[PDB]
Amino acid sequence: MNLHEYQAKQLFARYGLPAPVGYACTTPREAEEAASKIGAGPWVVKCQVHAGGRGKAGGVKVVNSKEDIRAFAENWLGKRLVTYQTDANGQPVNQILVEAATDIAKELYLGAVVDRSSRRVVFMASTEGGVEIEKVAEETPHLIHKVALDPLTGPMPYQGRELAFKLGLEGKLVQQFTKIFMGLATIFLERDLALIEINPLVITKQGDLICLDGKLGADGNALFRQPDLREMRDQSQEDPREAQAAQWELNYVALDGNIGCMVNGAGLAMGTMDIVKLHGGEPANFLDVGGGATKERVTEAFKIILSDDKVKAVLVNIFGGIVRCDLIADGIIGAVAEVGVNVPVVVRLEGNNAELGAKKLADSGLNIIAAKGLTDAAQQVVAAVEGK
Amino acid sequence: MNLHEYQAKQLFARYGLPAPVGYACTTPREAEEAASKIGAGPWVVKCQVHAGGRGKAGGVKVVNSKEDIRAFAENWLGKRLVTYQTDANGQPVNQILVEAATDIAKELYLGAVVDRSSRRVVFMASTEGGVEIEKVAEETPHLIHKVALDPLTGPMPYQGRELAFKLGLEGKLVQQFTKIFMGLATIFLERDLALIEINPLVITKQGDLICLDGKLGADGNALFRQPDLREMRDQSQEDPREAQAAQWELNYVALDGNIGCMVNGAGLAMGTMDIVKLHGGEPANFLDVGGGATKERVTEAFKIILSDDKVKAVLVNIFGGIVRCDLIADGIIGAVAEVGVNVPVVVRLEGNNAELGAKKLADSGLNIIAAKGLTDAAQQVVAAVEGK
Amino acid sequence: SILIDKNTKVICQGFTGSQGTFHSEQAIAYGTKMVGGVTPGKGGTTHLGLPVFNTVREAVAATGATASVIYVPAPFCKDSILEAIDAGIKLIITITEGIPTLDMLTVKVKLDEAGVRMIGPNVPGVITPGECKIGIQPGHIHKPGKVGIVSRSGTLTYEAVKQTTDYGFGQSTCVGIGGDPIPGSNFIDILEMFEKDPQTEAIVMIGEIGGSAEEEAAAYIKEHVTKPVVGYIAGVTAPKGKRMGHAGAIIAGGKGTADEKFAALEAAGVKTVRSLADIGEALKTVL
Amino acid sequence: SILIDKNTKVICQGFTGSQGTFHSEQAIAYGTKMVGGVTPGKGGTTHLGLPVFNTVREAVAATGATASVIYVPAPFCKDSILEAIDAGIKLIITITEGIPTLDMLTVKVKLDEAGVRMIGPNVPGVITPGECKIGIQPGHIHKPGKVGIVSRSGTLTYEAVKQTTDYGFGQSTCVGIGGDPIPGSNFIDILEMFEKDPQTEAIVMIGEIGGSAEEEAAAYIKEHVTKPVVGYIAGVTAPKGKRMGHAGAIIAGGKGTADEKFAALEAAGVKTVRSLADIGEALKTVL
Numbered sequence A, B: 001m002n003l004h005e006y007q008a009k010q011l012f013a014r015y016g017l018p019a020p021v022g023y024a025c026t027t028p029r030e031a032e033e034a035a036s037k038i039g040a041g042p043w044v045v046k047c048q049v050h051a052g053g054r055g056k057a058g059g060v061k062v063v064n065s066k067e068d069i070r071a072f073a074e075n076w077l078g079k080r081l082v083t084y085q086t087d088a089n090g091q092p093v094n095q096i097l098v099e100a101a102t103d104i105a106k107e108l109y110l111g112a113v114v115d116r117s118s119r120r121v122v123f124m125a126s127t128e129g130g131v132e133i134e135k136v137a138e139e140t141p142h143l144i145h146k147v148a149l150d151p152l153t154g155p156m157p158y159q160g161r162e163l164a165f166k167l168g169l170e171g172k173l174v175q176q177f178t179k180i181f182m183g184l185a186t187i188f189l190e191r192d193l194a195l196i197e198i199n200p201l202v203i204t205k206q207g208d209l210i211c212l213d214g215k216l217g218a219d220g221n222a223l224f225r226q227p228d229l230r231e232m233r234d235q236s237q238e239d240p241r242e243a244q245a246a247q248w249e250l251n252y253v254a255l256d257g258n259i260g261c262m263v264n265g266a267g268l269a270m271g272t273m274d275i276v277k278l279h280g281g282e283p284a285n286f287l288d289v290g291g292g293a294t295k296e297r298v299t300e301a302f303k304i305i306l307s308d309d310k311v312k313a314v315l316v317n318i319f320g321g322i323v324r325c326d327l328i329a330d331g332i333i334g335a336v337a338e339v340g341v342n343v344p345v346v347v348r349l350e351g352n353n354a355e356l357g358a359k360k361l362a363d364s365g366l367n368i369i370a371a372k373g374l375t376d377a378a379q380q381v382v383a384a385v386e387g388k
Numbered sequence C, D: 001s002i003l004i005d006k007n008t009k010v011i012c013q014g015f016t017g018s019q020g021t022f023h024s025e026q027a028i029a030y031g032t033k034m035v036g037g038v039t040p041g042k043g044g045t046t047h048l049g050l051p052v053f054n055t056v057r058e059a060v061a062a063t064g065a066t067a068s069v070i071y072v073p074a075p076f077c078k079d080s081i082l083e084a085i086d087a088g089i090k091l092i093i094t095i096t097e098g099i100p101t102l103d104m105l106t107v108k109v110k111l112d113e114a115g116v117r118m119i120g121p122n123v124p125g126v127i128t129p130g131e132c133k134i135g136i137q138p139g140h141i142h143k144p145g146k147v148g149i150v151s152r153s154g155t156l157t158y159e160a161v162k163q164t165t166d167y168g169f170g171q172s173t174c175v176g177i178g179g180d181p182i183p184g185s186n187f188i189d190i191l192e193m194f195e196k197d198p199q200t201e202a203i204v205m206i207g208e209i210g211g212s213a214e215e216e217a218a219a220y221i222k223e224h225v226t227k228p229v230v231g232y233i234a235g236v237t238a239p240k241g242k243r244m245g246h247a248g249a250i251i252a253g254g255k256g257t258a259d260e261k262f263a264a265l266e267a268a269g270v271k272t273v274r275s276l277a278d279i280g281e282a283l284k285t286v287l
């Protein structure tokens, strides 16, 4: 799960890591009243949303009057900021972070993730701050530097210095940097983070390192032992459906398309979508039942897939599972009738008595086709939509 | 450095580990007034000294009246408790620990140290509580159980359970034990301890695990990063001379003998003593100059060795060093005159111009012999004392 | 075949739990040599007609088992896996889903260092048709054979498993290496096995978007694998951004795309198939 | 000879400090190939006529050195040793005294795992008479020869070193493994070396009370060493209880006594000597 910028800076603070002085506000009054608590302007107002590119979108501004702060807060709180990292529908702004302006001398990049290839936590540092690192990697690689934490010894200082010297830092800035490396590396391990991204790590005109902007990504799987990160989850930041699909042990994700896919197994799901859009067709989504596919799960699954209206036909593909294909076919029927499914459904049962199951779907009456085989079920779902 | 029992229980507490309710008192009034703060008797009074065997020595008693507590405190505070683990001169009692009596059902043993052989921190558990484990090892080995912490993963729960099951524990006691294992193992690592010894780890009539008595040994070398343990050092518990020898970068330790040995190098020191007591002779002590053997170090070294009066002759054996043998010989002379050494000294210089040095000691006049060779210097120091 | 066989003796950690029970029965009925299980606090009892122990060491000593299968909830796996490693077990199959990535990061180093092999976590298991079955894969869609299967996906494996059984090719051994960011074994581990295995005449490699395990397997295949390999990558229609079911499922940095992997596999000499339905055909070809 | 020689190229960590400076000069004057040193923040300067770098990696890349000697204060060794291990250095000689035992516990595992050899900590160093000298041992009391020396003690080594030079036996190589509870190398490590070394005709093993490294060496000697070994254990007059200079110096548990070790060595076929003065004689005998 992702944390808001302000939440990350809070953590950073907690670990003795420099961040601009500021406050997260939930109303224009709070926003403007924060200007004084901070000091003299100009001040920086930033919408708090999980996606990036907030700058380009005008979700970040530097002002010089309580009037502007007030105006800015007034304009965004409640609205939804849409950046190049948000879906075309953007994300709600429920807090405006108001902090002090920083005298930027140079912008650096510091970040960490779990390198799947080297199977270690890797910290990256670059002199290319304020830039898409993804890009820096592409164009100028030799400007990115890495180190891997040793699971046996923990983050060591010589590593922070190595990066500091690569960045050409010297004097106190080297020690300062080494501290931030040790600090971040510790948060990463102790808080079970999946990613850290200090972009930019600023060197001020005054000559000090400060984290002007930070993005933290936590490891969902570790949340049971991360009570604090657990409480910082901001539901309003991700697609709602995905959220309920979750408590309902489903796994939703939407796409454009017109054909709804309901498969059990993330692999088979992508494979199903792939095969559908191979026979023409257009995958309207990715829904991984979860296997424990019971009748309720199937009824909920149908609701979520059909909560969207671009869906013209639903393709069910259940291979294996904990329930016998006949009981699975019933859940498909009972759900189609209850949720009052109003679309042609093409099922593809597999496993125990998929025979009897396939039949239960033919005699049901409901516009529930019962394809024979993956390849087939494809063509038929593709067919049932052609024209609409 | 060692910690008092009360200091250890404090730490244990800090880590959520069960210990009797009690208080460390420095005056009879405090002692007796603590009885009420605790609850109803009987209560347990225990002298606080670093050595063990306090029980046998009568330094621990179970009382049933404020009058006794008062009496007991009154009798020990200021006195020196002498046990089989203290030198025949005992150790000062400056605190009396007063805690609640415990309903002991069974006594177990839990302890940990750094096994030099396996190069790991090893925890030992046994059902032989209240007994010298050293003994249990000798007689009944199969009753001792061990586990080693993995430097890579840290203390794991399955390890605490392994020990718990060996001890025949079951039910809540297993989980309880596992907790104490995890707790102790953490203190050991986080606080850089060299040893932990919960003897006995008690199972109460009420059916719970509690640390009736604990002994913690910290790693001196890590004290720079152990500010708290650093402040708990109780100077009054170890021989005073050794203490000053320390700030004076010397390394003292006394024995019976009559011949004082002053060597540079712990190895050469024991080797010197060994060779002296090989040619008859009697090593009165072990003093490792430290090599940086300057004139002041030598003058201080002579004071400490001669702060004792069983010393009839001093044997100096300086091989190598940072100062040229002639300058070393001067320090020997200047010290013998200043400290007014009143004993026959037999030096054995080696290294740079040990020639000129050896001479400076002959023409000095002082009763400073200048032996030629290890073997020789021995016989001569042995000789210079024979008769006194 | 690789990893297991008729002789492999297995103990189950988390044996008295819902899933440990249910599947141990299935493995039992398939004829897998289940010699017992472990559940702290239940040692001394018998379950599914087998001894239940408190510690893995007790079980190993008592049964001489060498492989352990884990059905312990995520919050406790690091403790189960590390215990099994320490008890002497040489093959661990962790079915569990949800282990913190940092946990597996450490365990992976341990496993390596201790010379212990682990399939998983987050996997259906491993199966040698006719001989041994450790996991949750449908035993009825398999058939002793000549094709080896490795898959980052669970269900997809089944599609392939059925196809090879349907073309009467049979399976030498099926291995689900799993999804998770840092797994016990990767493609290159299992591939090097199928290569050195006589009974395996051809290989089916199933991957998906995310990471670069496949890209790395590709280079290995090209430089070390000789037997024919048919490959399939899912998630061509998957969009950048969200994680598709698994965490390693996201296609980030403009890398780890399905097409990227396909090409690399192709350039490595691997018979790729665009539709998961033609895996059987592809084999029929190369065989 | 073992460990080092005329060709060994050395870098010094903590090169610009008092001791790093003083002794680097001594090693320099002895003809040891000091190619540079490392001191964070002083990279780019030259010291004792040699390049000073900020990181070990820079130095290794710049000089191709393979051995590093450490003169860094205890509070920072774990960081120096781990850096050197990671920079590719294959031989580390840590002169430092005072490293927390838990630090060396971890480092020891690392060293092993990474195939890196370390003499120390808390040692005088290593010296191959006439060829290479890394440490603080007196170069003037040595003499190229046929006897190899291993010692848990610093100064004692010198007594032995002088005696062998005085009987015109000469030293193949001198190694102080150190006192500290968990050292980089133990007797068995160095012994196995002297054994496989042609130039070494006889061995002198110096130990002391505490632990059981000697007892373990004894069993090794008896089962694997063929060359003659003269042994000496100090601390026969040492009393149980206090630590004699070193932490590993205490004779606890009624074990690790001097006499205990003597016997074991004797039973192993080692020529023991009761007086450190007769080490030369003992050699004269066996040689």
Ligand SMILES: CC(C)(COP(=O)(O)OP(=O)(O)OC[C@H]1O[C@@H](n2cnc3c(N)ncnc32)[C@H](O)[C@@H]1OP(=O)(O)O)[C@@H](O)C(=O)NCCC(=O)NCCS
Binding pocket: C013, C014, C015, C016, C017, C018, C019, C020, C038, C039, C040, C070, C071, C072, C073, C074, C076, C079, C080, C095, C096, C097, C098, C122, C123, C124, C125, C154, C155
């Ligand atoms: C592992 C998993 C199956 C467990 O589910 P489960 O069986 O319902 O869990 P239960 O609580 O019923 O059983 C767990 C058992 O673990 C045991 N246990 C706990 N810690 C243990 C340990 N360290 N060692 C051994 N057993 C342990 C307990 O015995 C418990 O059962 P019991 O106390 O009732 O006897 C579940 O967490 C999971 O990961 N599911 C997803 C698996 C998956 O999808 N894999 C992908 C394949 S495609």
Ligand SMILES: CC(C)(COP(=O)(O)OP(=O)(O)OC[C@H]1O[C@@H](n2cnc3c(N)ncnc32)[C@H](O)[C@@H]1OP(=O)(O)O)[C@@H](O)C(=O)NCCC(=O)NCCS
Binding pocket: D013, D014, D015, D016, D017, D018, D019, D020, D038, D039, D040, D070, D071, D072, D073, D074, D076, D079, D080, D095, D096, D097, D098, D122, D123, D124, D125, D154, D155
């Ligand atoms: C190691 C020891 C010699 C250091 O003593 P020292 O030279 O006086 O210490 P100094 O402060 O003068 O020098 C240490 C240098 O380490 C350097 N340093 C610190 N951390 C460093 C690191 N990680 N890497 C490299 N150099 C580092 C500094 O450069 C410092 O010198 P500088 O900053 O002045 O240039 C001392 O701590 C010690 O252990 N003495 C006992 C040794 C012993 O008795 N051994 C037994 C043999 S028998």
